[PDB]
Design a protein around this motif. Structure first.
Motif, PDB file in Angstrom:
ATOM      1  N   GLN A 141     -48.687  44.667 169.379  1.00 44.75           N
ATOM      2  CA  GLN A 141     -49.594  45.743 169.762  1.00 44.75           C
ATOM      3  C   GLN A 141     -48.825  46.982 170.162  1.00 44.75           C
ATOM      4  OE1 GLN A 141     -53.096  44.986 172.358  1.00 44.75           O
ATOM      5  NE2 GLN A 141     -52.737  42.813 171.870  1.00 44.75           N
ATOM      6  N   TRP A 142     -47.687  46.786 170.816  1.00 46.09           N
ATOM      7  CA  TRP A 142     -46.866  47.911 171.233  1.00 46.09           C
ATOM      8  C   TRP A 142     -46.231  48.561 170.004  1.00 46.09           C
ATOM      9  CZ3 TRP A 142     -41.703  49.493 171.037  1.00 46.09           C
ATOM     10  CH2 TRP A 142     -41.390  50.573 171.884  1.00 46.09           C
ATOM     11  N   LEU A 143     -45.674  47.734 169.123  1.00 48.37           N
ATOM     12  CA  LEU A 143     -45.009  48.194 167.911  1.00 48.37           C
ATOM     13  C   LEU A 143     -45.933  48.947 166.981  1.00 48.37           C
ATOM     14  CD1 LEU A 143     -43.163  44.884 167.035  1.00 48.37           C
ATOM     15  CD2 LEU A 143     -41.997  47.000 167.657  1.00 48.37           C
ATOM     16  N   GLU A 144     -46.991  48.274 166.552  1.00 48.25           N
ATOM     17  CA  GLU A 144     -47.948  48.868 165.637  1.00 48.25           C
ATOM     18  C   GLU A 144     -48.406  50.231 166.140  1.00 48.25           C
ATOM     19  OE1 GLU A 144     -51.032  45.903 164.267  1.00 48.25           O
ATOM     20  OE2 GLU A 144     -49.743  44.508 165.338  1.00 48.25           O
ATOM     21  N   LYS A 145     -48.316  50.433 167.451  1.00 50.13           N
ATOM     22  CA  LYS A 145     -48.711  51.693 168.087  1.00 50.13           C
ATOM     23  C   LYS A 145     -47.736  52.846 167.875  1.00 50.13           C
ATOM     24  CE  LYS A 145     -52.485  52.518 170.415  1.00 50.13           C
ATOM     25  NZ  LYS A 145     -53.289  53.722 170.042  1.00 50.13           N
ATOM     26  N   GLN A 146     -46.481  52.658 168.267  1.00 49.21           N
ATOM     27  CA  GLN A 146     -45.448  53.691 168.155  1.00 49.21           C
ATOM     28  C   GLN A 146     -45.339  54.404 166.815  1.00 49.21           C
ATOM     29  OE1 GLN A 146     -45.433  51.951 171.695  1.00 49.21           O
ATOM     30  NE2 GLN A 146     -44.677  53.991 171.102  1.00 49.21           N
ATOM     31  N   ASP A 147     -44.994  55.693 166.870  1.00 49.33           N
ATOM     32  CA  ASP A 147     -44.838  56.543 165.682  1.00 49.33           C
ATOM     33  C   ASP A 147     -43.428  56.352 165.111  1.00 49.33           C
ATOM     34  OD1 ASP A 147     -44.327  58.659 163.822  1.00 49.33           O
ATOM     35  OD2 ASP A 147     -45.636  60.046 164.907  1.00 49.33           O
ATOM     36  N   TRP A 148     -43.210  55.237 164.420  1.00 46.84           N
ATOM     37  CA  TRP A 148     -41.886  54.967 163.887  1.00 46.84           C
ATOM     38  C   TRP A 148     -41.439  55.954 162.833  1.00 46.84           C
ATOM     39  CZ3 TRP A 148     -39.353  52.266 167.161  1.00 46.84           C
ATOM     40  CH2 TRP A 148     -40.078  51.406 168.007  1.00 46.84           C
ATOM     41  N   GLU A 149     -42.368  56.472 162.035  1.00 43.49           N
ATOM     42  CA  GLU A 149     -41.972  57.436 161.018  1.00 43.49           C
ATOM     43  C   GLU A 149     -41.235  58.592 161.689  1.00 43.49           C
ATOM     44  OE1 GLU A 149     -44.798  58.853 157.847  1.00 43.49           O
ATOM     45  OE2 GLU A 149     -44.004  60.815 158.493  1.00 43.49           O
ATOM     46  N   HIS A 150     -41.808  59.093 162.775  1.00 45.50           N
ATOM     47  CA  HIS A 150     -41.207  60.191 163.523  1.00 45.50           C
ATOM     48  C   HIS A 150     -39.826  59.790 164.068  1.00 45.50           C
ATOM     49  CE1 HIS A 150     -40.181  63.081 166.448  1.00 45.50           C
ATOM     50  NE2 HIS A 150     -41.389  63.499 166.783  1.00 45.50           N
ATOM     51  N   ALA A 151     -39.774  58.682 164.799  1.00 47.68           N
ATOM     52  CA  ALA A 151     -38.516  58.205 165.371  1.00 47.68           C
ATOM     53  C   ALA A 151     -37.461  57.967 164.290  1.00 47.68           C
ATOM     54  CB  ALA A 151     -38.754  56.920 166.154  1.00 47.68           C
ATOM     55  N   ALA A 152     -37.916  57.714 163.070  1.00 45.52           N
ATOM     56  CA  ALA A 152     -37.001  57.472 161.965  1.00 45.52           C
ATOM     57  C   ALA A 152     -36.299  58.764 161.559  1.00 45.52           C
ATOM     58  CB  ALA A 152     -37.762  56.902 160.781  1.00 45.52           C
ATOM     59  N   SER A 166     -33.490  61.512 169.354  1.00 41.92           N
ATOM     60  CA  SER A 166     -33.961  61.405 170.727  1.00 41.92           C
ATOM     61  C   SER A 166     -35.237  60.551 170.818  1.00 41.92           C
ATOM     62  CB  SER A 166     -34.198  62.801 171.322  1.00 41.92           C
ATOM     63  OG  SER A 166     -35.259  63.481 170.660  1.00 41.92           O
ATOM     64  N   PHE A 167     -36.217  60.821 169.956  1.00 44.37           N
ATOM     65  CA  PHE A 167     -37.444  60.044 169.989  1.00 44.37           C
ATOM     66  C   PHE A 167     -37.000  58.606 169.763  1.00 44.37           C
ATOM     67  CE2 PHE A 167     -41.502  58.724 170.278  1.00 44.37           C
ATOM     68  CZ  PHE A 167     -42.434  58.957 169.292  1.00 44.37           C
ATOM     69  N   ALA A 168     -36.206  58.423 168.713  1.00 43.77           N
ATOM     70  CA  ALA A 168     -35.678  57.114 168.358  1.00 43.77           C
ATOM     71  C   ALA A 168     -35.003  56.452 169.556  1.00 43.77           C
ATOM     72  CB  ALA A 168     -34.688  57.255 167.211  1.00 43.77           C
TER      73      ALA A 168
END
Ligand code: AU
Lengths: 652, 5
Positions: free
Chosen positions: A35-46, A50-52
């Protein structure tokens, strides 16, 4: 969650789900923080360090919370696992969170594809399904009918007792002649017994008739079919149905028969007590008692089968092939199962018993079993238990001082001993092949492959004197299977076709016919060839092969076919037809002021053991027309970038 | 086979 939604698919997708999780990003995490994972904006962090980096530590903290949740439940395992997963995750991305983000992103992203590609429920808007349904009915019938009889026998027995009691009472008490005409009050009672008896006899017969008839289906269809599947299954075919369904059908009819037997006894006990000229119990007495045992004997002999063919634990990959001096195992089982059979069936193993070739065939080698020759059938808790003996500890030994394709067989004897009841049980495994050295396995397996693909019987042992031929439509499937059992993928249409022709020439037909000589018979044969490729694939190209990044089987003819008019760089991966060791090679096209075609001297394990194929594909280099080194390997087949495709497989 | 390793 998207995680849940996935665990709700046909085993074909959740299988691809599997192949998305390795030690890099442990699936344990993907699930415990879904639930935590599916939430985060991984595309952005990718795309933003810093976001990463921020999210990386958040992910670690989320793991800590999970560790404490487990500490509470005292789930020592997960605590340990979570702990390891964190430590891993940690020293794998604490210096490169951008890549961990890219991993999570594409991982979640690739999951969707599977849920999108799992909506083929459009292409979803009885064969055996109905068959299985009927048998349950007849069987159930047999059952019910037996109980029905057993119920009238009791009514029959009671009447007679009263009746008797009533007669005795009259003829035991202190114009009486005319009053003695009461004899009719008896005459009536008699007409009753006679009628009730005739009735029971009728049903008992009818029942037998049915039973036998239903028994024919069970033994001549169900049993035969299951046996055949067990064969293909042992050859690499689809998972064989367990016995439970049969074991139930058998076991039920069996109880019924056993009861009819009791009924027949009860009926004679009523005959002792009373009989008469033309008494049905007396007339049918024998015929019935015999029909019954007849059925029951056949039934219980048909039930004695080999549940697990002879196999060496060390080479679980090749069942029916036994190497001398090495230990093997088999497992017997009686589809009947009646407590009154527990530990009362001693089973013995016999090698090549009742074999002609022992004398018939010249030279025919002869071996002797060495381990434990006898085992007693016990019950063993399945979800229904089962009555079976299993043989661990069997060794074959050469008693000495066509070629190695001679078939032998294992025999299993046992016997049922009870009151004035004795039945001998015997059955044999599928033909076996005995060898002296590992080097023969491939060849041996070839025989087993041929034998089982064509024959249906458990005995001949002389099969290889007039080896039938194989309908390509059939050999092809068996071949795919050989792959789809050592790897995660089989052979396809295109791959199969190339193989078709290399056997049936150009006029390849689904109804072609391949002689056994054109299979395992100036350089080495087909099977031995196909075999050594699987060897190579196994020890040197699994991921590449599994991921379908290998064409493997194209004719040099069809080779250019696709390679003509195509992106200059574009190359192809195929297995060599030449090498008698098993090797792959690549071919590609180039433009040289029509297309020019090139192919490398096939790479064998001799090389692949030194440098990874992907690495080779990477650093390959040749002299260009400009006399300047560079590697022509640019695009895989459908125009994929060299690095794009083999990227993950690169050594470094 | 036209090209070397
Ligand atoms: Au098997």
């Amino acid at each position: 969650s998207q995680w849940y939604e996935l665990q709700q698919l046909d085993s074909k997708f959740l299988e691809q789900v599997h192949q998305l999780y390795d030690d890099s990003f442990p699936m344990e995490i993907r699930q415990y923080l879904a639930q935590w994972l599916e939430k985060q904006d991984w595309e952005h962090a990718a795309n933003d360090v810093s976001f990463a980096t921020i999210r990386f530590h958040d992910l670690l903290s989320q793991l800590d919370d999970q560790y404490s949740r487990f500490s509470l439940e005292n789930n020592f395992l997960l605590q340990h696992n979570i702990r390891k997963s964190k430590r891993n995750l940690q020293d794998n991305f604490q210096e490169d969170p951008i890549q961990m983000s890219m991993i999570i992103y594409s991982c979640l992203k690739e999951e969707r594809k599977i849920l999108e590609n799992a909506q083929r429920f459009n292409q979803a808007q009885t064969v055996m399904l109905d068959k299985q349904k009927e048998l349950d009915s007849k069987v159930r019938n047999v059952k019910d009918k037996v109980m029905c009889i057993e119920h009238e026998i009791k009514s029959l027995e009671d009447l007679q007792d009263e009746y008797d009691f009533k007669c005795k009472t009259l003829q035991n008490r202190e114009a009486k002649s005319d009053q003695k005409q009461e004899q009719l009050l008896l005459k009536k009672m008699y007409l009753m017994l006679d009628n009730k008896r005739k009735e029971v006899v009728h049903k008992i017969i009818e029942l037998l008739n049915v039973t036998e008839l239903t028994q024919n289906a069970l033994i001549n269809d169900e049993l035969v079919e299951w046996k055949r599947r067990q064969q293909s299954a042992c050859i690499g075919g689809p998972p064989n149905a367990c016995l439970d369904q049969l074991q139930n059908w058998f076991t039920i009819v069996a109880e019924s028969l056993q009861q009819v037997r009791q009924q027949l006894k009860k009926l004679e006990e009523l005959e002792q007590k009373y009989t008469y000229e033309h008494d049905p119990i007396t007339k049918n007495k024998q015929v019935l008692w015999d029909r019954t045992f007849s059925l029951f004997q056949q039934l219980i002999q048909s039930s004695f089968v080999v549940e697990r063919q002879p196999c060496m634990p060390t080479h679980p990959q090749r069942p029916l092939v036994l190497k001398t001096g090495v230990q093997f195992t088999v497992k017997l089982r009686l589809l009947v199962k009646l407590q009154e059979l527990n530990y009362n069936l001693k089973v013995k193993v016999l090698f090549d018993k009742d074999v002609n070739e022992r004398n018939t065939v010249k030279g025919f080698r002869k071996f002797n079993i060495l381990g434990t020759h006898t085992k007693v059938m016990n019950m063993e808790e399945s979800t229904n238990g089962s009555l079976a003996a299993e043989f661990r500890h069997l060794q074959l030994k050469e008693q000495k001082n066509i070629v190695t394709e001679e078939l032998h067989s294992l025999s299993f004897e046992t016997q049922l001993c009870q009151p004035g009841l004795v039945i001998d049980l015997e059955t044999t495994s599928l033909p076996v092949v005995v060898i002296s050295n590992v080097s023969q396995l491939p060849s041996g397996w070839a025989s087993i492959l041929w034998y089982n693909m064509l024959v249906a019987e458990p005995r001949n042992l002389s099969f290889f004197l007039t080896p039938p031929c194989a309908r390509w439509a059939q050999l092809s499937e068996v071949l795919s299977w050989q792959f789809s059992s050592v790897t995660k993928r089989g052979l396809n249409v295109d791959q199969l076709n190339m193989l078709g022709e290399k056997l049936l020439g150009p006029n390849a037909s689904p109804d072609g016919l391949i002689p056994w000589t054109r299979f395992c018979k100036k350089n080495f044969p087909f099977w031995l060839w196909i075999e050594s490729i699987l060897e190579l694939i196994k020890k040197h190209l699994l991921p590449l092969w599994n991921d379908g990044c290998i064409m493997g089987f194209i004719s040099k003819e069809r080779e250019r076919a696709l390679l003509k008019d195509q992106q200059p760089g574009t190359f192809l991966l195929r297995f060599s037809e030449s090498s008698r060791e098993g090797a792959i090679t690549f071919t590609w096209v180039e433009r040289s002021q029509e297309p020019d075609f090139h192919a490398v001297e096939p790479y064998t394990k001799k090389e692949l053991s030194a440098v990874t194929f992907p690495d080779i594909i990477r650093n390959y280099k040749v002299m260009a027309a400009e006399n300047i080194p560079e590697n022509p390997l640019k695009y895989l087949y459908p125009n994929i970038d060299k690095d794009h495709a083999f990227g993950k497989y690169y050594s470094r | 086979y036209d090209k070397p390793h």
